[PDB]
Design a protein around this ligand. Structure first.
Ligand code: ZN
Ligand code: ZN
Lengths: 65, 48, 146
């Protein structure tokens, strides 16, 4: 549910760039420019950041012990 | 033998024995559901 | 003129205001509101094998979802507990009986005639009108339509 550590296709580490991308996009910057700045040229990597969902917060509230 | 259990709702610690207890109850909040906690022993998981 | 991208804004409000399962909730709410009283008024009353005593029916009232514990008293019930303890999410059904002695009516009496299962998120369920925080605290998915 949390952001994947590595890109599925080419194995590049993109786990640490998700929050940066989200915060920058929310500020109104061009998503393409932000992705290029972060250093993701192959669209295989860009897909992981663009299509991700953060469901960990939604499923965190129910505990099982 | 006496065993350890956790409440479903309040998540507190509740101790009782099923073979004797005629009425399961959480004394702190009255919940009728209890969990069996994870034992404190190491387990090995393969990262593959 | 208007544009399809504008009509989309209007159309979205339809699903925004009214859920996707309204055809169940509306019918069940109408049932609770009127159908019980109508089906009771259809029968009218009960006339046993008695010389000069009979009972005519009155109003119907349905209470909150509750459960009579075997070792305790009636307690409030929630859907999570009901579906974990293999219970049945139902509420008590109350009926008023009017006794008639020799053609005159006596004081009404209210009795329990049974339990009626409650459709979730209906106008009588405990989840009605709750915010997402409360539903989270009750162990429910806030996106559940009921
Ligand atoms: Zn990649
Ligand atoms: Zn408890």
């Amino acid at each position: 549910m949390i952001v994947p550590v590595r890109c599925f296709t080419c194995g590049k580490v993109i786990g640490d760039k998700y929050y940066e991308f989200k915060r920058r996009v929310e500020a109104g910057e061009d998503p393409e420019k932000v992705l290029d700045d972060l250093g993701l040229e192959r669209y295989c990597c860009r897909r992981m950041l663009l299509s991700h969902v953060e469901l960990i917060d939604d499923i965190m509230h129910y505990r099982v012990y | 033998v006496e065993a350890v259990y956790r409440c479903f709702k309040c998540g507190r610690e509740v101790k009782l024995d099923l073979s004797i207890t005629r009425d399961l109850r959480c004394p702190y909040c009255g919940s009728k559901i209890l969990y069996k906690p994870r034992p404190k022993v190491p387990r090995r998981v393969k990262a593959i | 003129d208007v544009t399809p991208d504008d009509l989309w804004i209007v159309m979205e409000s339809y699903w925004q205001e009214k859920g996707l399962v309204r055809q169940h909730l509306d019918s069940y709410n109408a049932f609770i509101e009127r159908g019980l009283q109508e089906v009771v008024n259809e029968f009218g009353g009960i006339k046993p094998d008695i010389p000069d005593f009979e009972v005519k029916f009155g109003k119907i009232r349905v209470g909150e979802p509750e459960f009579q514990e075997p070792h305790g008293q009636r307690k409030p019930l929630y859907p999570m507990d009901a579906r974990i303890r293999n219970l049945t999410y139902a509420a008590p059904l109350y009926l008023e009986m009017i006794p008639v002695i020799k053609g005159v009516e006596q004081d009404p009496v209210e009795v329990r005639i049974g339990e009626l299962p409650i459709m979730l998120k209906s106008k009588v369920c405990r989840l009605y009108g709750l915010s997402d925080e409360e539903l989270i605290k009750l162990g429910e998915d806030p996106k559940d339509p009921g």
